Amino acid sequence: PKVSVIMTSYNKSDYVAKSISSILSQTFSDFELFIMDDNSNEETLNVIRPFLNDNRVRFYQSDISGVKERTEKTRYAALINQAIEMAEGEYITYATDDNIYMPDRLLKMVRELDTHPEKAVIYSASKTYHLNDIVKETVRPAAQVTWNAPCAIDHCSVMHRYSVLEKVKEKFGSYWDESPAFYRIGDARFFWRVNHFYPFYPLDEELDLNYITDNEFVRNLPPQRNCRELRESLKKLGMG
Numbered sequence: 001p002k003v004s005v006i007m008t009s010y011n012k013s014d015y016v017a018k019s020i021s022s023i024l025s026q027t028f029s030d031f032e033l034f035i036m037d038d039n040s041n042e043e044t045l046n047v048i049r050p051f052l053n054d055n056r057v058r059f060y061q062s063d064i065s066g067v068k069e070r071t072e073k074t075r076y077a078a079l080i081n082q083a084i085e086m087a088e089g090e091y092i093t094y095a096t097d098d099n100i101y102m103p104d105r106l107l108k109m110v111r112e113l114d115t116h117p118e119k120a121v122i123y124s125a126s127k128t129y130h131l132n133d134i135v136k137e138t139v140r141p142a143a144q145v146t147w148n149a150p151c152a153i154d155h156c157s158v159m160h161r162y163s164v165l166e167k168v169k170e171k172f173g174s175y176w177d178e179s180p181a182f183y184r185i186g187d188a189r190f191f192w193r194v195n196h197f198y199p200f201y202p203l204d205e206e207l208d209l210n211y212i213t214d215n216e217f218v219r220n221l222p223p224q225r226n227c228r229e230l231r232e233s234l235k236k237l238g239m240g
């Protein structure tokens, strides 16, 4: 397939169907969809189950269980890294169980990369609906080429050439960073790695959607490193 969509899933029974469905109904149909479930509850598994009937879905379920295992690594990064190793697509993109793809997302992103061989990483604008019907709408723009993606661009707004992954692994030893110190902003940390070698090219269109309302787990992670740290290191890096 031209595109490998890598989605992660953990206990979002009320939302995961809409997420999956938004991918399976894309106008661009030449993709494989990895559903990397991190050993979710019964309710979640049962919502996902019918979608496994779609011949494009490649479902993998971990055996992870308990606070030690959930806090040993940034789980989604480990899952994403696993999927990357199995991916057959020329282009790679990410999805989650709480994010919705707009119908022409894959089509528009694939066209951008097909058309511009010089661009390796692209990103679109993203929209979040704050609920309570809608009380607030937040848009994350995609107006400029950027060498400083961390915390400015979301997990779910990017597509890149597979070849990007080689470079990243060559320097850092892995693709996404599994260190649990980057649990809250794992996307930013992976974008930080990519930004050592590639700028992110914009698609001034809103192509993904989030809905939001306007623990022994938290207490067992290491101190969390933050955005500022990443942005300053890239500014010092001085690639742009």
Ligand SMILES: Cc1cn([C@H]2C[C@H](O)[C@@H](COP(=O)(O)OP(=O)(O)O)O2)c(=O)[nH]c1=O
Pocket (backbone or CB within 6 Å): 008, 009, 010, 037, 038, 070, 075, 076, 079, 095, 096, 097, 098, 184
């Ligand atoms: C907590 C956890 C999340 N995940 C997945 C669920 C989501 O697809 C992804 C991000 O988690 P999420 O809870 O959405 O974090 P955020 O606070 O950024 O919204 O990680 C796992 O795979 N394993 C886990 O143990």
Ligand SMILES: [Mg+2]
Pocket (backbone or CB within 6 Å): 115, 116, 117, 118
């Ligand atoms: Mg061009």
Ligand SMILES: [Mg+2]
Pocket (backbone or CB within 6 Å): 155, 184, 185, 187
């Ligand atoms: Mg996030």
Ligand SMILES: [Mn+2]
Pocket (backbone or CB within 6 Å): 096, 098
């Ligand atoms: Mn989320």
